[PDB]
Ligand binder design. Structure first.
Ligand SMILES: Nc1ncnc2c1ncn2[C@@H]1O[C@H](COP(=O)(O)OP(=O)(O)NP(=O)(O)O)[C@@H](O)[C@H]1O
Length: 213
């Protein structure tokens, strides 16, 4: 049962700006998305100070990076607060207008694309390295949904009947551009994290498939 929606025109233009930009340091997308994940963890951490049962859906607090070389997919999963169905429809598409106008203007004045997070639209930095993205999410006391976009004019939101259960949190599935498959590599991923994400309150886990010989 696939609900369709349309992007606000601003978000669609931000999505087209980023998915096209020629930019040298495209690796900063990873700092942005780990930064979101850290924020989403902060928020479940807060609720669990008041109410510790909130952590029972997924007791470990982590950020986890899962290269899927078979599918040319990089997955970024956190055990954060997660997002409701309505959250997905508004937080992604249908909102964010404030930061996006400011940011498009700062760029025309010379701003470095790496400053996108100061305007709080760093999520869309993912399109530096990807042309398709799925967002899977599960908030305590609500069901698991998946949100999907092609950087175009519509996005779907649909109940999640095909993915591993998150327990609680959010997982981004980046369909990497063909020029950008370096970000599936264990060494590459190690460099960017230690370079850009040294001060993260939570363990950053990298998942490596290694053949036994
Ligand atoms: N990994 C994630 N886990 C949970 N919610 C997320 C995640 N990434 C994005 N979101 C939600 O989607 C919105 C879009 O992200 P972005 O456009 O980068 O906003 P932000 O205001 O910089 N993020 P934050 O400081 O993490 O609340 C956020 O405000 C969150 O509400």
């Amino acid at each position: 049962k696939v609900e369709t929606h349309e992007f606000t025109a601003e978000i669609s233009q931000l999505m087209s700006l980023i998915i096209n930009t020629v930019y040298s340091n495209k690796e900063i997308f990873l700092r942005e998305l780990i930064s979101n994940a850290s924020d989403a963890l902060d928020k479940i951490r807060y609720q669990a100070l008041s109410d510790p049962s909130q952590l029972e859906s997924e007791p470990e607090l982590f950020i986890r990076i899962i290269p899927q070389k078979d599918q040319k997919v990089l997955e970024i999963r956190d055990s954060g607060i997660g997002m409701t169905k309505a959250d997905l429809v508004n937080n992604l598409g249908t909102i964010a207008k404030s930061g996006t106008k400011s940011f498009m203007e700062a760029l025309s004045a010379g701003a470095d694309v790496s400053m996108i997070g100061q305007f709080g639209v760093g999520f869309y930095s993912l399109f530096l390295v990807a042309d398709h993205v799925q967002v899977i999410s599960k908030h305590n006391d609500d069901e698991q949904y998946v949100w999907e976009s092609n950087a175009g004019g519509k996005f779907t939101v649909t109940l999640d009947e095909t993915n591993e259960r998150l327990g609680r949190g959010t997982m981004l599935r980046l369909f990497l551009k063909e020029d950008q498959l370096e970000y599936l590599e264990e060494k590459r991923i190690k460099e960017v994290v230690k370079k850009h994400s040294e001060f993260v309150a939570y363990p950053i886990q990298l998942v490596v498939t290694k053949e036994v010989e």
